[PDB]
């Protein structure tokens, strides 16, 4: 019957231990690996991080030099640009369980959503003191002319723990036996450059000189963030067992079958607690600023929409979250305080009712969620 | 507790039945007809002993009446001589309900090689395709008549030694129903450019092809002289109270580079899965797929593989590849089984998606009658 | 004295735990790494697999594009062909202990022996239904003409566990500290192409156009097969300790000193339990279909041959095992049910009594064996 | 290393470096215990060009 | 369209059995018994009252 007291007590014990760990341990961010390579030779890498304490996440620095060898035509950044330097990232913990498995662009948009502004960007102000884009932390030339070489830098934070204060999703890596694995599939000369008229979704640059663009090199450095000198007690190490037994993951998917003026519904799976949802309307390679959509919504089994909104009003809600708009055709939904959980109510779905549908149209979905390891 | 003993008893009873009864394969019905008149038949098997399955022999003569154009076998060919099969037991409970091609592919998966095929070897002794057990001419030229032979095994029992799914009909009284829908002049021939999925021949002369006639003979396989003990007949109650069925379904909504997930239902113990990528009438050898997988919600992929590596696993099971666009997955040792609907899904992430694309699914599973 | 009861009990406990692990865990096959490279730049790679649960083995997919740039002459596949895409494979477990260390051709012949037919081949039948070589799982053009480019695909299974049901040789990889290592030494432009008259043993193609053949690229993908969600008990994880403390390895060697009509004997070492033996008679670069051999045998210290047979009768025994013959000059011996163990009887040797011996003749031996980790 | 390389000639060089962790073969001061599968050691070499 | 683009319509239970798998005209016949005429082209009705 009742006995649910266990949960209540478990939550309290988990929160208490989390606090003790945060108070007693010390945060460390350490380089684990750096490599420079030619994408023509290789683009997929498997990084083996260190097994020390509780791992919170990885900061991945990526730099690249791209030369546009075309005789006459230039190329220009796509909407995602340097966020496409990493095509896909997948993490496995010591028990070989998969956590995040998503695209670089999705990971980057979530980094932005969680910062509350374009990730690691430099705001512009009227200050006479010379603050500004001094260090080019995330940077890429808007265009690369025929014969020119452009230099790019972009960063991604691959999260395990939900935040610096909420260790839900963190990973205990102390078993010398099995290693963690951070797999990075980088852009290469076949994904980074889109010809005029081709789909720019996964590309960095697009334009009439694309066929002659090539990477001179790509370099990456993985920094691992963790907590060391974990606190001990009578029963050994004090550890938030729920935090460490919960997966905090980002995943993406693709769905097709849209038709003008008809509700296109993407169901949320059960068991997962969805914190945020991103929907990219790849309208056959065209990315529009809401003009190809009637409305978007989140709906429960009951025909009840909780936020059926026209595109600009939907965008207004997002401006309250990241202080600007996501790129054309990218829509965001924050459900952090009340995660979508199909057990709480009936099934739930994310809805897009398109106004215009080009051939090969599809919705690319990105999700942020918590789920029990077991 | 219990069960340990229920299963132990079931297995003991199965063994006694196999040891004491005697297997019989008997013709129950034969018929010749012209599909222009009829193509659906309801065969009434005999209610005797424990029924294990039915071997269905189908022969047909196809005439290409075109003036100058020929037709050639589709990838499924004679496997499409039977379009669908449905079996109802004496208690009005359905077991298998699937297509002829899916049934045939499962027959192959269970044999471990193309069903009833003749393997080619260097033997100087004249073994070989002597009897043309499953046979069909590669092409039928304009004005020619081709002769075809096809066999299907409709299973009730899982195998010759595992009676799970078998049917007790020595008593039931009420009749069994083996429903067969055969190919006809509208399904057997595909014009150039048309979808060849359900057809036997395709080509420029298709519009003028027709069946001269089709014949079928159903053989029933059962166990007779059932063993009797104290309480009466010794029977494996679990085996006889479990359904072993094959079923098919169709799913659409595929989009390039996006995971297309087909959820497995709960309650069923899925032994195998077949997925056919009918890419708008085009059937490709993996080139239109990024990867296939089986996935558990919140536990990721247990076998996310590129098409060739997926095909490699299948080569270990049937010693060759299934036809273009046909993908197989063996889960016999550890059946897909979720207590919650869709806690597991079959995944196909397509590279190329043509108009009218869809996945035709085929399942082999066990489930309780109750 | 007795007390050997311990062994008997240990075996029972090992078998019981193996069964529980097989029944309770779930099998997973997951990609760990993929790379495309130019053999002119590099051909040796060290792959770091994931440390998750009990590792059973690795399925390695290798593809390549080879162009014959010769102006006029073609090249043809050698007897081993694509099986020589990988020259050598070596595996080290987390404790840095070496398991398999052998040639790609030997590993492939053992894959065939254990399947009971040419590994991952497509048999030919009279079926009218279009089964067949649809997916080209293991494939290579028989010849590559002057100016043409051929595409190849081959697969190797690198075993740790003996089989899917016998976990002897499997590896427990849970220590985050030390990584496993799978080293692959691939073919390159110096090993893959043999000139007319040169030794074809390690080459893929041989012919008058060989000097102008080159790889355009080689690509590999390593898939790791393992058991996850291992069963736990009162004493923690239930594990077959003998299985996990036994090495199941493949190794190869070379011996010379053959003389016509004289028994050439290769001794089996002590301690190892030899499951199979492969002997390749590289008769100075010539590979013959038994015609250069009087007989082969396995012999114990006692002049007692257990199977002294003429080449065709030896080949007949092999046809019962793999349903066909191994390539010219390749001889196989199955000792799986009663492994050669020099403790069981005196020393034992594999014998070849050659009829003809060319200059630079040698026997290349391949062994499959079990041995105690300690 | 050849003392000189004439116009048009190619010279071949060989050199060795011992990068010490331990002070000597008998004094292990400075040696490194490398048994944690997690984190790797790293030896960076910046060559002449 | 007036049924010409449909093979059949039905109501089916998980048991995979159909309680009324009918060709379009026969499906329409059942509706004619309910409303004394046919619904407009492409509109199909099913009474489960």
Q: Measured on Cα atoms, how large is the radius of gyration of chain A?
A: 22 Å
Oligomeric nature of the chains = part of a larger assembly
Form type of chain A: globular
- The total count of helices of chain A amounts to 3
- Structural class designation of chain A: mainly beta
Largest sheet composition of chain A: 5 strands, antiparallel
Q: Order of helices and strands of chain A, N to C?
A: HEEEEEEHEEEEEEEEEEEEEEHEEE
Gross CATH architecture of the largest domain in chain A: Distorted Sandwich
Q: How much helix, percentage-wise, in residues of chain A?
A: 10-25%
How many β-strands of chain A, per DSSP? 23
Overall domain count of chain A: 2
N- and C-termini, Cα separation of chain A: 23 Å
Biggest interface and its residues per chain?
B-C, 46 and 32 residues
Provide the CATH superfamily of the largest domain in chain A. Viral coat protein p3
- CATH class call of the largest domain in chain A: Mainly Beta
Q: What is the percentage of strand-forming residues of chain A?
A: 35-45%
CATH T-level fold name of the largest domain in chain A: Adenovirus Type 2 Hexon, domain 4
Main location (chain B): virion
Organism (chain B): Enterobacteria phage PRD1
Subunit structure (chain B): Homotrimer.
Pfam families (chain B): Phage_Capsid_P3
Produce a short descriptive summary.
This is part of a larger assembly, with five copies of chain A. By secondary structure, chain A is mainly beta.
Describe the structure.
This is part of a larger assembly, with 5 copies of chain A. Chain A is mainly beta. Chain A folds into 2 domains: 6-233, Viral coat protein p3 (Adenovirus Type 2 Hexon, domain 4, Distorted Sandwich); 234-374, Jelly Rolls (Sandwich), CATH 2.60.120. Helix content of chain A is 12%, strand content 40%. Chain A is built from 3 helices and 23 strands. Chain A is globular and about 70 Å long. The two termini of chain A are 23 Å apart. The interface between A and D is small, with 13 and 6 residues. Chain B: It is found in: Virion.
